[PDB]
Amino acid sequence: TNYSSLNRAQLTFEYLHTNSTTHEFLFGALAELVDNARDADATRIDIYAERREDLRGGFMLCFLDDGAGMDPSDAASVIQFGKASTQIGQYGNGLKSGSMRIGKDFILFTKKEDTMTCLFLSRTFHEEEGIDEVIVPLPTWNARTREPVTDNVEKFAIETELIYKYSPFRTEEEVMTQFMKIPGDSGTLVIIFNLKLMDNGEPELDIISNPRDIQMAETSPEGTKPERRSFRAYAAVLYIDPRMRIFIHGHKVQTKRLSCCLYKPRMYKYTSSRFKTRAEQEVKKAEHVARIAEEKARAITLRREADVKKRIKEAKQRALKEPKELNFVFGVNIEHRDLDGMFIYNCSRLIKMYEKVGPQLEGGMACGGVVGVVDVPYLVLEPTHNKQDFADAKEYRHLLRAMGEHLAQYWKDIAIAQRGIIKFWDEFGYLSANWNQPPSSELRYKRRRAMEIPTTIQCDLCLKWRTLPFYPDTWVCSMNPDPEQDRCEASEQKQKVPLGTFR
Amino acid sequence: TNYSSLNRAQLTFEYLHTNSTTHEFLFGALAELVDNARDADATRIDIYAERREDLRGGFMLCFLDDGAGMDPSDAASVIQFGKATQIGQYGNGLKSGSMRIGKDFILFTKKEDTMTCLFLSRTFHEEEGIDEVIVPLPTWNARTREPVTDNVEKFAIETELIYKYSPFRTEEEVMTQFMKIPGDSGTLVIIFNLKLMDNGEPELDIISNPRDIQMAETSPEGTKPERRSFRAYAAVLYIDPRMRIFIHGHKVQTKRLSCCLYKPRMYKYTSSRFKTRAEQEVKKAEHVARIAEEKARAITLRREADVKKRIKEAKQRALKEPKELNFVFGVNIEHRDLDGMFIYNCSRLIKMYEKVGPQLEGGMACGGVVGVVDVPYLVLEPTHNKQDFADAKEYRHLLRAMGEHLAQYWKDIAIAQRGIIKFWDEFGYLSANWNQPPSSELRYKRRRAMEIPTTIQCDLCLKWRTLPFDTWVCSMNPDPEQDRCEASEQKQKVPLGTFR
Ligand SMILES: Nc1ncnc2c1ncn2[C@@H]1O[C@H](COP(=O)(O)OP(=O)(O)OP(=O)(O)O)[C@@H](O)[C@H]1O
Ligand SMILES: Nc1ncnc2c1ncn2[C@@H]1O[C@H](COP(=O)(O)OP(=O)(O)OP(=O)(O)O)[C@@H](O)[C@H]1O
Ligand SMILES: [Mg+2]
Ligand SMILES: [Mg+2]
Ligand SMILES: [Mg+2]
Ligand SMILES: [Zn+2]
Ligand SMILES: [Zn+2]
């Protein structure tokens, strides 16, 4: 029947702040926007600051990527909280969750073939007009000749006047400047302004102490990881396979696959029952809706609905033939021994980092300096609201216990206890007895550390990860000294890791 | 001007699951419903499991309280995401928690001459393909049980939707849940079609302990009881519990955790963050108040300006209050291994067993010390799940201040002079291990018993009485000064402490 007269769960002003409160990690709030840029299939995100002293915080936070962009339908689907194979976005709210943690308002400029769209979700408009609902101006211009593209001219006029009133771009030419800030035919520019302040009135994002970095505006104690104080260090290891370049203030971050930056990286295949059970659970949930859709078609659109969903059922049963094991990669961190811990990636995105499991939890000299990296998929684990924890805490703890057992196995097979922990760390540049000090940066110790680590670097245009046989600049495969991968059309040489057997 | 034709941000079906994903702590998801019942000024919540084999999980999860209840207006404001000395300020927590526990939830509330059902069912949206979040909202008169609505076809659709997807398939089956509220005002929240684990069992274990709601897992010896037992979690969920928590009809022995500690000393820490956030709160609310009075100078703007100056006059009285943070530190002697900081935000527990200061270092000193702070809402705000804090920098500043106050407390309590291993072993901890419980021998049990005063709560007046030595009344208090329910409530006389 018709439910037009029934009550609907609506949105209010304060729920933007409520959605903002999930991020105790403001770098996680940034990380959700760069996640959306990765979901755009972008080759490059520029995360730069535009100095605007008239706004709160003194500057805007602009997120410019060259991705697929958005049509008016997808742009209208942003403010629909929630959505309808390797993408990060599954919750449909994380842009709104992050941008309100970062700043009071955010304005989104995007472009996709001949339609380019502005999304101006403004909390300052809601304060200054006292409107309880979440009213979002969404005007669309033609991407070539710039006429308004809408079915409601007075609605377009109201939206654009609202943008020129509360946006940092008070004119249509200043809007067009942000629209041609996107260089390609498609892309998205997300500008977050009126940033959150501390008690002293300074913005939380420190962009002044390091001009090539977005920093946490606080002091740095001894035991604080650089990923929680530096967004450069966070975005370097934010992805388990970073194909898209990230530019902070126009400077590319040296991203790294954490498995290749480890001494003796051994790979472990852990057959997870959580992998197998929910892979078997998703095939009956998909077959249940396929049965009711088939009898619904048993007119043309209902038949086509079941026909294009029948191939979805063939895809998930094909995935059952793939073995349900998890890739446990363990390697010793020699460049920083103290920056060890477990780096849990969920569908190639860092959720939990620097986690101590197994004998790392025990207070003791051994099993320290090991970095464990895993890419769990979405059917094994789902992220939390902030994508900094895991929703299934019980099987997350099961994963941590299994990874502790695999850590103990990795520690006993590489035989550091047989060869000596103390002299092993002494010969690798670590002379002081303190754990948290960086190693000695002399020439022989630096060459000893860099001899074990293969130098991996990413090209600028083909975006492939090359290896060099003994704030980065722009790098192409042409100046690779290795003649096997001296061209951009060469196949990307995958990381080769020794295999370890656990029990 | 008018913005009726302008686009609005909407809610979709999958946002209920997205909102549900904020609760890594399922006991936090339960605790949000307990928080809403505390905001109801309920004297008693009832947490009970109604066994229903036709639903997922095998049983219903019921949240019955005798609070203020809801009228149709604030019952409709429940599904308005984001609303409002109350814990609830995010307008979200019931919707996040109930969808963390179960696929659907049906809410029965009653207030004054009216009573209202709130059905929000993800089963209805799944079986009907509904993209939006459609909530049936019928309202009955609390005496005559007639439909109180201006749209009888909408009422018929809402009620038939409840009878189709709710566990209560008839009007009489709905009415049984409506008279399950005993008083004139109250709220019954039913969570059904609960989330299963990998083995198909529900996540909430109600079978191993029939008086408790537990995590359905094998618990190692390092697990805190509040992370695996909802009875132990709701015992310390509030810093001043006037609620009577009832789990499966059994009253939870709640406690203010400060008085259950050996030698508790109080530290009044002057927080500059408390002073600074109060100093911007005074300048912000009058700015809203002065522009509300200008526009009201048409009757709706005066009502907005009257409640704005009510807030504006309230905070000016609170600025002259001493902007200090009350740090309470005590030694946990019934369980040495269950130590750590218990940070309460607006009298609601957020962080449990936080090791700060010398507890961070793996070592023998400052072990067994439990710190308790009632952080106001002016200092910090909770996260989406209310299991962390939004301001991580100021939370870490608070933790460092609590660490240095822990060091001050440790040098104050003179365990630095009376021996470290001679103090713990005479208190029942003969073993060299850390995580084992103390000795159950009678002289050690009585030695631990006489230090902590027995602070237990009456059932009618809800006051906390101390015994000098079940369902308990102030009449069988052996103390002659507090043998009646009309007696003045006696606070804990915890001595003050000074730093440096
Ligand atoms: N910069 C961008 N480029 C392309 N698409 C974008 C961009 N930002 C947002 N989107 C799209 O906008 C929609 C809504 O954004 P949002 O980030 O809230 O959703 P989501 O990525 O699906 O969610 P989440 O990350 O919480 O799972 C998504 O479909 C997302 O793909
Ligand atoms: N058992 C209850 N008794 C009385 N009022 C209730 C009850 N449960 C919910 N409510 C009301 O429901 C409204 C919205 O519910 P919700 O719990 O999401 O809001 P909130 O408590 O303000 O939010 P939060 O706790 O996340 O800050 C609140 O204003 C609250 O008063
Ligand atoms: Mg997203
Ligand atoms: Mg593009
Ligand atoms: Mg709430
Ligand atoms: Zn190349
Ligand atoms: Zn009494």
Residue numbers in the entry:
A (entry chain B): 4 to 87, 94 to 307, 339 to 510, 519 to 551
B (entry chain A): 4 to 87, 95 to 307, 339 to 510, 521 to 551
Paper excerpt:
The Microrchidia (MORC) family of chromatin-remodelling ATPases is pivotal in forming higher-order chromatin structures that suppress transcription. All MORCs share three features: an N-terminal gyrase, heat shock protein 90, histidine kinase and MutL (GHKL) ATPase domain, a central CW-type zinc finger (CW) domain, and a divergent C-terminal domain (CTD) with predicted coiled coils (CCs). MORC2 possesses multiple DNA-binding sites that undergo structural rearrangement upon DNA binding. Importantly, MORC2 mediates chromatin remodelling via ATP hydrolysis-dependent DNA compaction in vitro, regulated by the phosphorylation state of its CTD.
